[PDB]
Write a protein that binds this DNA or RNA. Sequence first.
DNA 1: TTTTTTTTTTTTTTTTTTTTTTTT
Lengths: 309, 309, 309, 309, 309, 309
Amino acid sequence: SFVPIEKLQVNGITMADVKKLRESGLHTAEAVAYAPRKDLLEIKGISEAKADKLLNEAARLVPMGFVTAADFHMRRSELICLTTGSKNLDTLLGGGVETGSITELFGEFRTGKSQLCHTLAVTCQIPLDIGGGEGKCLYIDTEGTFRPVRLVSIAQRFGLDPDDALNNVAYARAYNADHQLRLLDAAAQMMSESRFSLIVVDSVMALYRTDFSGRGELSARQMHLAKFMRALQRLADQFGVAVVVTNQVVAQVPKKPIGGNIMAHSSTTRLGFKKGKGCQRLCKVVDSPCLPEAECVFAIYEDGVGDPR
Amino acid sequence: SFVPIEKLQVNGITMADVKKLRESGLHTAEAVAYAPRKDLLEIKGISEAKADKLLNEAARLVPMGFVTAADFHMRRSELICLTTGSKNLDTLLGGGVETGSITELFGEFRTGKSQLCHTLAVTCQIPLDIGGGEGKCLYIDTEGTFRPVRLVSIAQRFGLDPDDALNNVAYARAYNADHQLRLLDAAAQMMSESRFSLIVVDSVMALYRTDFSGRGELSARQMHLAKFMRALQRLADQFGVAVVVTNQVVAQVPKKPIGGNIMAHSSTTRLGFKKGKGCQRLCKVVDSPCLPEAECVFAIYEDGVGDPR
Amino acid sequence: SFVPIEKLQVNGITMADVKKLRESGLHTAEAVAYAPRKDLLEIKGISEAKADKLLNEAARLVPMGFVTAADFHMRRSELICLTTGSKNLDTLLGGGVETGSITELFGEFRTGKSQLCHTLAVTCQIPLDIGGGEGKCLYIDTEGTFRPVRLVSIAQRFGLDPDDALNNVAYARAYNADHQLRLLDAAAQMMSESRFSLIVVDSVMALYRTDFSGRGELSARQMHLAKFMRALQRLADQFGVAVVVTNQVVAQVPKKPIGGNIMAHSSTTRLGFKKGKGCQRLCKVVDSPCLPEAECVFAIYEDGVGDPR
Amino acid sequence: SFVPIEKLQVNGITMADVKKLRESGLHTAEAVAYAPRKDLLEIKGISEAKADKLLNEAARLVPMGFVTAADFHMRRSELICLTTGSKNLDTLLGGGVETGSITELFGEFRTGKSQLCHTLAVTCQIPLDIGGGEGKCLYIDTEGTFRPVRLVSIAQRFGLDPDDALNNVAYARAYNADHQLRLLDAAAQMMSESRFSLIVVDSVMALYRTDFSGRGELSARQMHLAKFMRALQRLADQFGVAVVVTNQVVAQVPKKPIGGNIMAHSSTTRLGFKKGKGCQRLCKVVDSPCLPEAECVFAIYEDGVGDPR
Amino acid sequence: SFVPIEKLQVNGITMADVKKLRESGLHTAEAVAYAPRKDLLEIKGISEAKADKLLNEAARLVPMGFVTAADFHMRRSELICLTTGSKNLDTLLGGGVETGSITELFGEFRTGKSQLCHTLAVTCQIPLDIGGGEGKCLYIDTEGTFRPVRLVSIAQRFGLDPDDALNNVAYARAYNADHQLRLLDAAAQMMSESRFSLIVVDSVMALYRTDFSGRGELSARQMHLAKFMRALQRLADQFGVAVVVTNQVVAQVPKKPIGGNIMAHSSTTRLGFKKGKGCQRLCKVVDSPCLPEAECVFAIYEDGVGDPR
Amino acid sequence: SFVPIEKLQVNGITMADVKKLRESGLHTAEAVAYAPRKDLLEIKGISEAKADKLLNEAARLVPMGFVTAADFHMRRSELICLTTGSKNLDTLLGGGVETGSITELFGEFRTGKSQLCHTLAVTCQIPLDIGGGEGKCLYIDTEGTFRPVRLVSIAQRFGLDPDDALNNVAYARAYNADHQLRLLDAAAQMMSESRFSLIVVDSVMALYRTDFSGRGELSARQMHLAKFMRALQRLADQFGVAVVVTNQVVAQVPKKPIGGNIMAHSSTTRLGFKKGKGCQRLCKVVDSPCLPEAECVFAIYEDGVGDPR
DNA sequence: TTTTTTTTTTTTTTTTTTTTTTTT
Ligand SMILES: Nc1ncnc2c1ncn2[C@@H]1O[C@H](COP(=O)(O)OP(=O)(O)O)[C@@H](O)[C@H]1O
Ligand SMILES: Nc1ncnc2c1ncn2[C@@H]1O[C@H](COP(=O)(O)OP(=O)(O)O)[C@@H](O)[C@H]1O
Ligand SMILES: Nc1ncnc2c1ncn2[C@@H]1O[C@H](COP(=O)(O)OP(=O)(O)O)[C@@H](O)[C@H]1O
Ligand SMILES: Nc1ncnc2c1ncn2[C@@H]1O[C@H](COP(=O)(O)OP(=O)(O)O)[C@@H](O)[C@H]1O
Ligand SMILES: Nc1ncnc2c1ncn2[C@@H]1O[C@H](COP(=O)(O)OP(=O)(O)O)[C@@H](O)[C@H]1O
Ligand SMILES: Nc1ncnc2c1ncn2[C@@H]1O[C@H](COP(=O)(O)OP(=O)(O)O)[C@@H](O)[C@H]1O
Ligand SMILES: [Mg+2]
Ligand SMILES: [Mg+2]
Ligand SMILES: [Mg+2]
Ligand SMILES: [Mg+2]
Ligand SMILES: [Mg+2]
Ligand SMILES: [Mg+2]
């Protein structure tokens, strides 16, 4: 899947160097190849003529150049898509949630944004025959709305055993906007010792709202948010996983998502949710590079997301 | 239950720094662990080294990482819930009011919100075998509708001595929004010395209506409200108590609650009350993370909330 | 009772400060302790660095904090209730009109609201041992229906002195909404020197019906009204006076009061009137914080309000 | 259309010198004629008395003097334009995007910058008689939004062979700003072996935002960008290709492009995009040395960009 | 209107000395008169005892002595001035752009600098009775924005055959800073054979930005720029022509031109441009020897610079 | 006012020797007495037995030795001072511009130094009882910003005739440093035939910057400048006139004058000019042996330098 | 032993309110 970080111990590079890189946050050779010279120079003990050797060796083990469009097409026709549990939603997105990008979901209260995440936390483990990825799940929660009792029911629906289903999921809660960025290094270190398929952030902007209050703090807030989004995208490129994030709305003094232009330009796919009749809900594609604009209906039942009955 | 704050006095940290932190508002190690470095820096007399040492010690004391979902399920199985006094209501709520989150009640005039809060303030003290919480209650009133004469009868119903029931409630009245926000620090200071189990805030939005007037003052109003809500949630995290708040309605020019999206997105459970025939009221679940939509019927009597006769 | 506003002159405060305060409208320490700082920073001369000085003062004069509910019971067990002239009404009200809160009376034309106001304006002077308030009365008229011969006849019924009686009632007439609101400052000034015991507003929504017209101004109307209502409560908080307000009805399209949700939520007690046979009338309790629903009968005579014969 | 660098060895210059130059990053005689002397005296192995000879020889093969405006008028009269697929835009721009200069596109999210880049990557491969280039495309992606399925659809629209269309586009992904600058050397190497007609940078400012953060790094940012822009111009001088670059927007704390005065003075043409009704968009000319302000409308379909019905 | 250099060869000076002097870069007697001795003793083949002869010989042909201010006043009255195409501007300038001086035009992007330079390039050939100059223009472009079609549009406005108006302009493009300085020698050689009456340099600081980079090259950059300005002033003195340059701006971290004190002190007149409403622009007087501050308004049309409707 | 040279023709000294002295640049007995024996040798015609006799002569007619303080005080009390024209300026300088010294004005562009020079040039011709000298003007120009029209306009405000105001001014233009120093011999010779009260050099360092460019040529530029300043001082002492000189500024990598330490020590009075609001300017004394350091405000108007209205 | 020079560069959204009025 990836190139380990111990393949760089050659031409004078020792074990202390690799240990220092590990302590900094780099855990594979891809991370080394993706960083610029100044970032390495900021690492204690890494002087010049070590940085040039590290970069040249990493670029030797990893390619960064030109390839035809046909090669990229061939490599893209093998990416895995996750299944949502509903056929209308699968048809709308062309198969499901894809790996290697970022999907964003926004709407008002009780429109079903976290039930879908709960369903994907179980659908990412089943065999690839029925639309899974045979992996684990990482969950980051900033609101306090995570419940395993729904996972047990969804597992029962999909044919898995409860103990294994709950044993293949890792959970963490965030308390401010620095802890949120700190958890990503731990995630990257955990992902290189086993196999993962999905990452969830629920939600992104909830803690940024109160930590930077009013005009006079807007610039710092937007810079911090941009850093977080770049780190998430780098994780997705490193490990080949799927990333899902949630967002809130505000009124135009008829409603729009929060986060400014950084958020709008950073996401790859954007979906909007609306309330319907009874237990039904409506979904619409707002932004995407390869799908047209359309809408569909889904429903919430005791065992997860499904089609209208 | 929580880690005292005097355990952060190692590696040459003087009691003057601890006293300054307490005067700022923090009274547990968890509280220091939950705050970003900017907040500590704003305090006079705290430098970079002091802040770094404080953060490291707190993080070592309190766990902040990744666990498994089975472990979290096993922990959540031990959370207790409080009985409301009505069997249909308890069945509708999955057992009663749950600790660790926030519940909001809304309706029009004379629909039963204040009486339910009174009955909860009495029931949160009875032995845990029958459904109590064995603690004290903290009541914050902003309209002037608190009446101990009701608590006397409700306590008589469950078999308590009126003086014990009356002495174990701490009451406070507010006169504008700033006093409202200020009282929370005194609440937190009081909490860390005794065993509390419930906080009540009656009409969080009554004072905000007239302190800010018309368009041109909306943003400041919403920002102040957001800070208030975040402080409430942090208290719930720190001490593992239950929090109840009430709200008012307005007409659509058929009735909806006031407060906007800031209030809609930050509550965990939402209940709507309606007037019925005689002394009977109707209750509906409008929002929840693990319950479906359902309705029930309860009644108001001289001794509190109960089942229809 | 109310502490004078001249006690805010201990450190760094002169007589000019109190002068501009009394020009603004404040007439007691409580009036300054219950006010927000933004309001303080709006009087020419008080710019900044002095509002905090006043706020810190009066904080040790006016008590503000958390107390036990048993002490609140002890405090509230010493309030004053003024008789209504009818025994059935006194029994239905649990003692009589209560000071510190707001009581509303509504009904259709010639049902007996204004006669009750006239009776109260005299009963609020007799000694406490017979149900009287032994103070003065303030009366505000908005329809041109104040008739002083009724006062003489009623006062004779209760064994008073007509010359003594007629000089103990303050009478005002208003011509528009702004004039109505402005009379409240003179009311506070008059209450600042001589004791009073009751405020009567008859009626409260008469001029609002005309000064604001069409759907294009409702938003402003309900805002203006809101401020008025808040101001009334503040007086009851300072000097401990009983407020009595009157209101009209409209047809549903069988009758309901006017004012909307602002009025419905802002009142503490609500009573409804209907016409009986001959001079008799029927009264009903439509809302209350501590009383059940019940009905009663009274009657109108040459000398006020009494029991049916 | 360019003089090969191998002609630089005539008398006194050996193949080793040309090899050293090629390793430096010069691939044509023009690249030597346009370079200052202190740039030439910076490649190890090159000594004085040889840079002078190189410049003297290059000046002989590449003309650098004075001419009359009639000659310039004729030469610019014989120049090529690339069709955008929309007749409205072609009429607005006077033919279309022209080879030799820099055209910039700016707007907010989902306004259609990337769809026009995808359309141009196909129209740059069709014959000259129908507004084509008869070249190849270079695509540099800093966002990760390149999708070859759109290429196949558009190619079928314009009557190409999808296999060949996929073999005639070169694609690269950049991970930081130094990598972005370094890819231009490989671009220069590639264009000197086979004919190209179009370069796309999508987008130009995305990685600069996070690589340099804050006030203290603004100058070094704007200097780096300057170099990049200058390099782009040189390519258009050397091989005669069209350049298209993409840009984002920000809010005036009503929206403006990012990049500053360097960006504003370095671009020869600027276009602004806005969101219309359905699948329709509005285009406005914001800068040009020969064209007036105006506006038009276009649409996004399954096969690319086109005219609205 | 100048003394040809062939007059300097009288007795003891041969033709080869004149040929060497011309190869050095001097083409007029005034040129030798204004040059110091030290740089005369820098051309190979020029030995002492001849520089003294040249300095003595030329002083008798070019009057360099003390004169009365009345004679100078008379001389400064038969001075040419060229119309800018707008009546508002000519009044603010006192007649046009004066020959023998240096005028600078600065402003942000698309403010009309290059358009005014394109209009001036035509009026410098129309007869004297209407503000013309009856000569030729020398145009130096360092950005790529010179368009011979605007000249075609503007020429017919003033009544010219566009072929003549096109053949009477000399155009040259520069690529680095040293080329820019090298072109001035050819310009000076051209001016000594036919009648020219203007010189445009657009822009003057574009290539200096990137040829020197950082704080470590500022001194050399600023010393290189001084020689350019001195040579321009020498050409203005020698042949009596107007000299017009253009400049860019930066942000003060509201905008200022670039170039420093060297540029600020060397120009005779300075004018700033700004963007108006529609096709309307504003012009200001920022520095002059004998003019007061004042502002006007002009407009850009398809036929050049004019008054606002 | 001084001893004519022709008075030194005595036993042994003939007309030819005095003619040789006149040709060498000595046009006064003081000039002969001001030079050291060494200097009176480069002339062609005197070797020895003549220089000693000349030194013995030219010293009995000119005192060179000790005096008292009171005698010098009495002789210096009869020193005429020119008037600036602005009362604030006249007060600031203790009476106006003095004679027998050197004044240096420096500042950034368009700060008003040249206008002040023009005003002094016309004011030196007014009758003495209002602050004049009753003499002519000597103007030496290096930048090329001399305008007679300002003199024509400034002659009116003082009652002088225009034609006679412009008939008493000699003008010269300098083209390099050699010529700049050469002009002084002619200046002194002409002044030895009339009455003069003003010499102006404007500006003094413009031509030195590019004549001695770059390190390695330093330390010769400074010698040339020192010789020029010494010659100026000798002129001023010989004829008892006033001298004015202007200067430029550079930035410190907030601005300082150019020239070095030779300039700083050689000048007698130094003044710094700053830009103000509208047409106001600020002045500050920087160096003076018998003056305090203060700041003053003046203004520029169509008639000259005046008080701020 | 001597003898100072010379400016540069933009960034970045927020946040709802408030009922009226009888007819044969
Ligand atoms: N056990 C359950 N059975 C059926 N429906 C449920 C169950 N639990 C929650 N729901 C539904 O899911 C909704 C909650 O949506 P959620 O996705 O949590 O909102 P948000 O969009 O704010 O994240 C509730 O309105 C409820 O109707
Ligand atoms: N002792 C009592 N017995 C029966 N009903 C009561 C008693 N006290 C109050 N009530 C009823 O409770 C209602 C008031 O409910 P409350 O909680 O005050 O409404 P809200 O808080 O929503 O304004 C009234 O309609 C009243 O009839
Ligand atoms: N002096 C009186 N003697 C007997 N009955 C009276 C007298 N004055 C008024 N009433 C009766 O009492 C009623 C009082 O109406 P009022 O209270 O003014 O109506 P509202 O409450 O709408 O203002 C009248 O309808 C009238 O029938
Ligand atoms: N196959 C398709 N058919 C129709 N519309 C599409 C298709 N693919 C993408 N779109 C639409 O094109 C829009 C433009 O996206 P894009 O031009 O990539 O945005 P940007 O201008 O930010 O680069 C998207 O909002 C999407 O709805
Ligand atoms: N033919 C034309 N008709 C009208 N306006 C034009 C024409 N050509 C260019 N312009 C306008 O001239 C303006 C300034 O262009 P230019 O003078 O080249 O700017 P600058 O001088 O700042 O480089 C542009 O805003 C453009 O819209
Ligand atoms: N006739 C006039 N009326 C008013 N102000 C003038 C006139 N002529 C020139 N000025 C002002 O004088 C200033 C030029 O000052 P100048 O002597 O050139 O300064 P410096 O020589 O220090 O550069 C300009 O700002 C200009 O506005
Ligand atoms: Mg939600
Ligand atoms: Mg209520
Ligand atoms: Mg009435
Ligand atoms: Mg985009
Ligand atoms: Mg421009
Ligand atoms: Mg100047």
